Structure 1
């Protein structure tokens, strides 16, 4: 048979497993605490839903696996420094960055970057927006452990989701409009036909990247939409949240796409006929009333509900835009008030 093991017990793994079953592919998602003896790792291909991991007996063994795809790619991506660096080596648009070592760097820093400064964690994610006077508002921890970027005034956020096969073939989904709030992805909108020039450009970028990396499987690229054009923000070496829509909006979902690649399967270009809307469910309980709207696709992760925690998502796709928008509106009252903003935002796209 076809057998895969996924490093990580998360919802992504879950979704990957779900995607594989019908395909005859057996996915065994697995947590770091996992004993080597419980995983059939010795007989499968390995993938991961996580960028980095502790050194356990298992992870240790996976260190010498002739089948841990992209195993060595991770480390570069895992680190925001080397990542940013990667962009630089490729001559790909990105926000002016520096490593934040000394406090003895601040003056210049606020000099290079200007007014506002955005700081993030090199690893494990993680973002502080400081000004010339907030400078001591930050931990000393972040010294040579955090990066520093120019505050970017973008007009929109987009994400590019695609895959590269073992033969270098690549496929892409259309660009996805993303809405973050309090640094969390709240809402996504995907149009069957994105802006040609935008799409092309992004594809160029993502491809340069994946090939330079030698990357195999699905990877996502977060970008900013600027008057000066697109700028790469972040890279995710795995299926990404902003593509969850593909489960019901494309002929091949991302999870599927991933599996295909790593399992040496056909990687044709997925069909996308209609727009989709994804609603992230953050720290809310399941309201089966949502299921009254026929266009709604509930994806419940089955995790303990808790504040700020991603517990599921709602997938909405249809041919009728009216029907599509009416569903959204009807949703408002079925969701806690904090959801209203995103819903509306998405709604605004169909105007």
Structure 2
């Protein structure tokens, strides 16, 4: 019975453990502060749900582990500069950008990028923290700390956002789910909607890009590529070297979930193409307490994280899938009065995807 250890103690690891169980794979999520002595890392394949970390007794032990899959890929992706350079190397479309070295460069930056600059911390950002959207007369708001520690990109006016989640096997095979439509508000993902068949052109463009990246990196497991939809085609925004929030719908809307797919990849099990026959919606639960009334609606799949509820925190997600989009829209409509007000916008945006 394969053993896998996942570095990091969040919901991602928990979902990987839940997926592993019925497949006969024991998965052990280990936080950074864990005691290595307690960790069966020796008899396990190591994976992670994080991409960067401080040095601890646990991480020092891991360091010397032969089977930490993708170990060397993380730092490249963990630093936005190196990630952006990777797209450049591979000729992949992405927002024009540059390292933002010091105050003095501002003039050349706007000259280069346009009216709106999007400044991003090279490492550690998530949910939009560590991101600034500045105009020529607003540069003084950027913390000095940021000089040398941030990249700056052109503000992209996309018509929508989509991510491609897929996986690469140790033998180079790759498999993908259809593109997923993502809605972000205030920097955090709120809702995702996936259809069995995406714009065929967009789907091929994305697969070619993701494929080139996984190959170049020699990556094994699941990776998510977030892109921006523009009239010239997609632009890659960023990558996540792991299972990703946008693909949670796969737990209930694909024959093989992103969690199962990642475990198959890393343990070298078969990686056939997951079957996706119907559309799916996923609503993220953020800073809200669980309301079991949601369970009155039979299509709603509750995925609760057993995390402390605090503002802005991802606490769970709700998935719904059905071959009849009317049912989905109706389920959505019934959910509105059962969710806090800030959820209406995303729920309605999901409904409109079927309109």
Shift of 1:47: 0.2
Moved more, 37-46 or 58-67: 58-67
Task: Provide the C-alpha distance between the structure 1 equivalents of 2:102 and 2:202, rounded to a whole number of angstroms.
Answer: 38
Shift of 1:311: 0.1
Shift of 1:102: 1.7
Provide the secondary structure at the position in 2 that maps to 1:177. Answer: strand
Shift of 1:134: 0.7
Task: Provide the C-alpha distance between the structure 1 equivalents of 2:317 and 2:53, rounded to a whole number of angstroms.
Answer: 26
Task: Provide the C-alpha distance between the structure 1 equivalents of 2:347 and 2:195, rounded to a whole number of angstroms.
Answer: 16
Shift of 1:228: 1.3
Shift of 1:168: 0.3
Task: Provide the C-alpha distance between the structure 2 equivalents of 1:320 and 1:294, rounded to a whole number of angstroms.
Answer: 14
Normalising by structure 2, what TM-score? 0.98
In the alignment, is residue 283 of structure 1 matched against residue 277 of structure 2?
A: no
Provide the secondary structure at the position in 2 that maps to 1:204. Answer: helix
Task: Output one character per residue of 1:195-220: Cα deviation in whole Å (capped at 9) or x when no partner.
Answer: 11110010000000000000000000
Task: Provide the C-alpha distance between the structure 1 equivalents of 2:201 and 2:182, rounded to a whole number of angstroms.
Answer: 18
Task: Provide the C-alpha distance between the structure 2 equivalents of 1:114 and 1:174, rounded to a whole number of angstroms.
Answer: 33
Provide the secondary structure at the position in 2 that maps to 1:51. Answer: coil
Shift of 1:10: 0.2
Provide the secondary structure at the position in 2 that maps to 1:42. Answer: coil
Task: Provide the C-alpha distance between the structure 2 equivalents of 1:323 and 1:235, rounded to a whole number of angstroms.
Answer: 33
Which residue is equivalent to 1:107? 107
Which residue is equivalent to 1:214? 218
Which contiguous aligned blocks of 4+ residues in structure 1 show a shift greater than 4 angstroms?
none
Residue ranges of structure 1 left out of the alignment (5+ in a row): none
Shift of 1:324: 1.0
Shift of 1:135: 0.7
Provide the secondary structure at the position in 2 that maps to 1:136. Answer: helix
Equivalent residue for 1:308, pick from 301, 309, 312: 312
Normalising by structure 1, what TM-score? 0.99
Provide the secondary structure at the position in 2 that maps to 1:232. Answer: strand
Shift of 1:236: 0.3
Residue ranges of structure 2 left out of the alignment (5+ in a row): none
Task: Output one character per residue of 1:45-67: Cα deviation in whole Å (capped at 9) or x when no partner.
Answer: 00000011111112111111110
Task: Provide the C-alpha distance between the structure 2 equivalents of 1:303 and 1:315, rounded to a whole number of angstroms.
Answer: 18
Shift of 1:179: 0.1
Provide the secondary structure at the position in 2 that maps to 1:43. Answer: coil
Task: Output one character per residue of 1:122-165: Cα deviation in whole Å (capped at 9) or x when no partner.
Answer: 00101100111111101010111000000100011000000000
Provide the secondary structure at the position in 2 that maps to 1:91. Answer: coil
Shift of 1:320: 1.0
Task: Output one character per residue of 1:305-345: Cα deviation in whole Å (capped at 9) or x when no partner.
Answer: 00000000000100111111100000000000100000000
Task: Provide the C-alpha distance between the structure 2 equivalents of 1:124 and 1:49, rounded to a whole number of angstroms.
Answer: 13
Shift of 1:289: 0.2
Task: Provide the C-alpha distance between the structure 2 equivalents of 1:38 and 1:52, rounded to a whole number of angstroms.
Answer: 22
